[PDB]
Amino acid sequence: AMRQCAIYGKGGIGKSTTTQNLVAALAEMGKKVMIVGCDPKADSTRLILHSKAQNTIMEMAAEAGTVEDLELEDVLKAGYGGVKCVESGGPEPGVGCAGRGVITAINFLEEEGAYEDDLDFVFYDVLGDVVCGGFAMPIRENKAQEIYIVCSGEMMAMYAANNISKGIVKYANSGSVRLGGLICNSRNTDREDELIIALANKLGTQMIHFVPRDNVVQRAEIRRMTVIEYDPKAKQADEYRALARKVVDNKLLVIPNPITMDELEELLMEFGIM
Amino acid sequence: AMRQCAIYGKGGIGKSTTTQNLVAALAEMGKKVMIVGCDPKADSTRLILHSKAQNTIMEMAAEAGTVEDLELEDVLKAGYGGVKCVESGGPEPGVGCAGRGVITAINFLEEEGAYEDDLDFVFYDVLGDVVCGGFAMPIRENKAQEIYIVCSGEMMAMYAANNISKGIVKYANSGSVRLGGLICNSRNTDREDELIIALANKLGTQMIHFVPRDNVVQRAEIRRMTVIEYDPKAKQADEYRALARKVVDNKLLVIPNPITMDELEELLMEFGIM
Numbered sequence: 001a002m003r004q005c006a007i008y009g010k011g012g013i014g015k016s017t018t019t020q021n022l023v024a025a026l027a028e029m030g031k032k033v034m035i036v037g038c039d040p041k042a043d044s045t046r047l048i049l050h051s052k053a054q055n056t057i058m059e060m061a062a063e064a065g066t067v068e069d070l071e072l073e074d075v076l077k078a079g080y081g082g083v084k085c086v087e088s089g090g091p092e093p094g095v096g097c098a099g100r101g102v103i104t105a106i107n108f109l110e111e112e113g114a115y116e117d118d119l120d121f122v123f124y125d126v127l128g129d130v131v132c133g134g135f136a137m138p139i140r141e142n143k144a145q146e147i148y149i150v151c152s153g154e155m156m157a158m159y160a161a162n163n164i165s166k167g168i169v170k171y172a173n174s175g176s177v178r179l180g181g182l183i184c185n186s187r188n189t190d191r192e193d194e195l196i197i198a199l200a201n202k203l204g205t206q207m208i209h210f211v212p213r214d215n216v217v218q219r220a221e222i223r224r225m226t227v228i229e230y231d232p233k234a235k236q237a238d239e240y241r242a243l244a245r246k247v248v249d250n251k252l253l254v255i256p257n258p259i260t261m262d263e264l265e266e267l268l269m270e271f272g273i274m
Numbered sequence: 275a276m277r278q279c280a281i282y283g284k285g286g287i288g289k290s291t292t293t294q295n296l297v298a299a300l301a302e303m304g305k306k307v308m309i310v311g312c313d314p315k316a317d318s319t320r321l322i323l324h325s326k327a328q329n330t331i332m333e334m335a336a337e338a339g340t341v342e343d344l345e346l347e348d349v350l351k352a353g354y355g356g357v358k359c360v361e362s363g364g365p366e367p368g369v370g371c372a373g374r375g376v377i378t379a380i381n382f383l384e385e386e387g388a389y390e391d392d393l394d395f396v397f398y399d400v401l402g403d404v405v406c407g408g409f410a411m412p413i414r415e416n417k418a419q420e421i422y423i424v425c426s427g428e429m430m431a432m433y434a435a436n437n438i439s440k441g442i443v444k445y446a447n448s449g450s451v452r453l454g455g456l457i458c459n460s461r462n463t464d465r466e467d468e469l470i471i472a473l474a475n476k477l478g479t480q481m482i483h484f485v486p487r488d489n490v491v492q493r494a495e496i497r498r499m500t501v502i503e504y505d506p507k508a509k510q511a512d513e514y515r516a517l518a519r520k521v522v523d524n525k526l527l528v529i530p531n532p533i534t535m536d537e538l539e540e541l542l543m544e545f546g547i548m
């Protein structure tokens with residue numbers, strides 16, 4: 001078996017930094033992991049690959065002719081800890097549907113046998129500002145059973161978490177896609193941990209970890225690494241190790257309870273963030 | 275004549291706060307303005323209307339039967355300064371295309387005569403994390419000639435600005451959609467004004483205004499107002515008045531020059547934000 005997880009959240013919230021660091025910690029533990037980039041920004045694997053980014057399945061298929069002229073061994077790339085990496089890509093802005101590459105990529109990976117029995121985890125790093133087209137496909141088509149939402153005390157980040165949760169509810173009659181937890185990626189604001197705990201409890205889930213804001217992230221990423229690789233002794237490395245451990249041990253996977261805008265505003269008012 | 279402007283940018287960057295405050299300042303000057311909300315969050319008019327939000331054209335059409343059973347006089351609502359307000363709405367998460375309501379709304383407004391000769395400005399407040407479907411329609415279909423992008427020294431906000439610019443370039447052979455400027459909505463970081471000026475110059479545009487981060491915004495918005503209405507003497511009110519004046523006087527409307535990821539990273543490295 002293998003655990004199929006998707007990391008969702010609003011743009012810029014920390015999906016790719018959190019996912020790559022979490023996965024590096026899993027590999028450090030001895031887990032075998034694949035990352036599938038499902039964000040048109042297409043830099044979801046650069047810290048594992050020590051790279052600028054990674055050429056996408058949509059780009060590679062265009063240069064080869066069709067996606068069927070591609071070989072899995074040509075597409076998947078291994079980096080830190082043996083973690084395997086692939087990027088979906090997407091059409092250029094103004095053209096088509098921004099999520100269409102996600103559908104092509106996941107179907108290619110399934111057909112070509114990328115989901116080998118030896119994998120322990122697959123993580124999809126998915127744009128979450130809209131829940132439609134290929135960005136909804138991991139939920140609609142039962143590809144990621146465990147959804148973890150990166151968020152913060154930012155109102156927009158909590159709104160996104162609620163919207164993603166509504167998408168999970170919409171498809172709960174089929175498949176087995178569930179909300180596994182919220183990950184708070186701190187803005188260094190007071191009571192932020194308490195705020196995201198409260199939001200998680202209203203949705204029916206949990207705050208699986210509070211990730212501190214730490215400049216070592218920038219120093220590692222300038223060098224194209226995870227903090228796990230850049231400085232294994234860093235306090236922030238231990239934070240990502242704690243998040244990884246709690247993901248491994250997590251057994252709470254729920255159909256969430258989306259909240260009203262009034263509930264969200266009351267959360268913000270109560271914990272004095274605003 | 276009337277100037278059709280669209281405010282784009284990544285989620286949470288400050289589109290709706292900036293647009294409503296800018297428009298309040300325009301109304302304070304004596305301009306006649308309409309705001310068209312083109313973001314599924316659907317709270318782009320609440321500060322003009324003193325409201326929780328505004329019921330959307332998609333919601334109202336569903337309750338009436340079809341969009342043709344709606345009357346313009348039933349849909350448009352006037353608030354502070356006589357500013358007229360409408361919200362597009364969008365399908366629920368996981369269903370359809372998140373931008374489909376924008377197409378329905380703009381077409382309804384055009385057909386029903388909302389663009390009366392007495393208007394001086396129309397502002398569309400558009401989700402900009404993806405540039406596709408109805409979110410691309412103001413550009414693709416030549417509805418907003420002047421695009422202003424709200425951004426910040428945040429890498430994700432600059433990436434979004436570049437992506438929106440690529441969409442403008444893609445449709446420059448038809449219509450007259452142009453980039454009018456960048457608006458820096460400050461994160462209170464050093465050299466941020468210089469950073470966004472540099473980005474604007476690389477794209478071929480300008481920083482039309484640097485909006486400071488100011489907590490009076492939160493105090494006004496808790497009370498469902500713009501800063502212009504809440505405290506006309508506030509320093510931040512004068513900031514929005516300066517932005518409004520510069521938008522009125524702006525004559526630079528360009529086909530932008532999108533930059534590479536290397537150029538964006540060099541900007542961040544240079545100005546020491548990272």
Ligand SMILES: Nc1ncnc2c1ncn2[C@@H]1O[C@H](COP(=O)(O)OP(=O)(O)O)[C@@H](O)[C@H]1O
Nearest residue numbers: 011012013014015016017018212213214215217
């Ligand atoms: N815990 C953290 N501490 C400091 N900086 C962070 C942290 N998490 C993310 N960042 C920074 O935030 C920015 C956006 O993160 P990223 O993972 O790229 O967001 P997303 O993938 O959600 O768009 C990056 O510059 C990253 O280095």
Ligand SMILES: Nc1ncnc2c1ncn2[C@@H]1O[C@H](COP(=O)(O)OP(=O)(O)O)[C@@H](O)[C@H]1O
Nearest residue numbers: 285286287288289290291292486487488489491
């Ligand atoms: N200049 C500013 N100073 C302080 N807070 C701001 C400023 N601009 C925006 N905000 C706050 O940022 C949050 C997001 O702004 P909003 O306009 O709703 O973003 P968007 O419409 O782009 O999603 C809101 O809580 C708003 O009050």
Ligand SMILES: [Mg+2]
Nearest residue numbers: 015016039044
């Ligand atoms: Mg990312």
Ligand SMILES: [Mg+2]
Nearest residue numbers: 289290313318
């Ligand atoms: Mg908004």
